[PDB]
Structure 1
Amino acid sequence: MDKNELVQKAKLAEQAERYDDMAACMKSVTEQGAELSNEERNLLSVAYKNVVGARRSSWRVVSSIEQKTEGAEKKQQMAREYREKIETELRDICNDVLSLLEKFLIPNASQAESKVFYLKMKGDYYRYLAEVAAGDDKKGIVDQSQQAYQEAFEISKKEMQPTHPIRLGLALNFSVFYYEILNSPEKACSLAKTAFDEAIAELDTLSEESYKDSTLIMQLLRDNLTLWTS
């Protein structure tokens, strides 16, 4: 239960592609209450990304199957129940992250880049909840996502260079929120195009540490733009 040991085990779990183990280690690190280093922060994010990603992918498959089996009630009821079980896992994972975010990560964020990272993450995990939200709760979930993204967005435009990978990654995910959650293609495109164009005009401000991350995100911004406007 030592911190450096937990971090090393997390790295080992990542190599082994055992992301449940990875998330458990990094959760334990976070719960010790100290602000996460950049490396620790990224390990936590990678771990939960894979843990929730597996559920998101499974959910899409099963929800799709559920829809296409109308009039075969026994098979559909079976598909529905399985979707709901996956959904419960998914919600528990998102609530796990969102709780760590409220209790430790966002309050301990001393610098702007860290505050943007965590607010972005809060935006993401509410967005994943919104993907599977139905009825009453959806509008509330959607507003929680939007508000976290919006605050991150404003802070990033004030404190970070246009080519900063965290600022670009936020624009990318916030544009996806507009496209997929708010059904506003036009606002999604505007946001993506601006982020891309402002980064393009300043490639000299890239560093050796971030030029690969930043240029990959730019490429994805443009990939999305192309798809959305076809």
Structure 2
Amino acid sequence: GAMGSMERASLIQKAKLAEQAERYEDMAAFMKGAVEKGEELSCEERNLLSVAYKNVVGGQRAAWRVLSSIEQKSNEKGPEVREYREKVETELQGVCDTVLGLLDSHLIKEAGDAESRVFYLKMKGDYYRYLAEVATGDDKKRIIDSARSAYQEAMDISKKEMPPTNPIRLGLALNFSVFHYEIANSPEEAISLAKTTFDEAMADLHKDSTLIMQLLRDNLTLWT
């Protein structure tokens, strides 16, 4: 597409340059072209991809929530807020559809490696859940099936290949829990998985993913 002509190794360097200038909007683009090349990503690369898209899709859900609030506070004045909440909704739908078809068409590969397979399904997980945050109807139904199916198939492959300290499994756990609580209407399972996680982890504390457990606990506080 818009980045076919560019050398792979240059895409990365520009990505990293974007990073510095904080043009995550472009950083994402660069990295997209990066992926489209067909070669597998390094660790350092995955993280750029991740970060660039985290940052874009992030501030999107941010202005959505800002707008979505101002849509409740307007339950006692004009359709303008609904439309502009719709426009932004679209944009986010769009970016998620992008990341989801990268993950699909390239990054989750046949055998792959164990450590990365998980990074990628965690990602599938989150991006189907950001869709869920704003989806509705039967559409919202089908989306949840997908985030679950994903987060799950990752859950399996991580605890059967990683130690409970590994910040990736902690992360994956953490979000799969947020998913249980916030999206799948299961505080029952969300509470119990945040706990099973924070416990088996606090145990083998002999990297520094103590920061992830601080999130796990922070959450469990609000849930009870």
The corresponding residue for 2:14 is: 9
1:226 equivalent to 2:211? Answer: no
The corresponding residue for 1:96 is: 98
Amino acid at match of 1:222: R
CA distance in 1, matches of 2:7, 2:197: 41
CA distance in 1, matches of 2:75, 2:170: 42
Kept in 2, the 8 Å contact 1:153–1:170? The answer is yes
The corresponding residue for 1:174 is: 176
Give SS of 2:160's match.
helix
Give the total of aligned pairs: 219
- Cα deviation for residue 71 of structure 1 reads 4.2
1:27 equivalent to 2:32? Answer: yes
Aligned partner (choices 42, 49, 52) of residue 44 of structure 1:
49
1:217 equivalent to 2:212? Answer: yes
- Cα deviation for residue 136 of structure 1 reads 2.2
The corresponding residue for 2:71 is: 66
Q: 1:89-126: per-residue Cα shift (whole Å, max 9, x none)? A: 00000000000001100026611111111011001000
Q: 1:59-116: per-residue Cα shift (whole Å, max 9, x none)? A: 00101111221342x2xx1000001100100000000000000110002661111111
The corresponding residue for 2:199 is: 197
1:111 equivalent to 2:110? Answer: no
CA distance in 1, matches of 2:60, 2:27: 16
CA distance in 2, matches of 1:95, 1:197: 35
Kept in 2, the 8 Å contact 1:120–1:149? The answer is yes
Give SS of 1:203's match.
coil
CA distance in 1, matches of 2:112, 2:100: 19
Q: 1:152-194: per-residue Cα shift (whole Å, max 9, x none)? A: 0011110111111110100000000001001221211110111
Kept in 2, the 8 Å contact 1:116–1:152? The answer is yes
Structure 1 stretches lacking a partner, 5+ long: 205-209
- TM (normalized to structure 1)? 0.93
CA distance in 1, matches of 2:53, 2:110: 19
Amino acid at match of 2:183: I
Structure 2 stretches lacking a partner, 5+ long: 1-5
The corresponding residue for 2:130 is: 128
Structure 1 runs of 4+ with >4 Å offset: none
Amino acid at match of 2:128: Y
CA distance in 1, matches of 2:133, 2:108: 23
CA distance in 1, matches of 2:83, 2:173: 36
Kept in 2, the 8 Å contact 1:112–1:159? The answer is yes
The corresponding residue for 2:148 is: 146
CA distance in 2, matches of 1:109, 1:118: 13
Kept in 2, the 8 Å contact 1:175–1:192? The answer is yes
Report the identity percentage: 72
- TM (normalized to structure 2)? 0.95
Kept in 2, the 8 Å contact 1:35–1:109? The answer is no
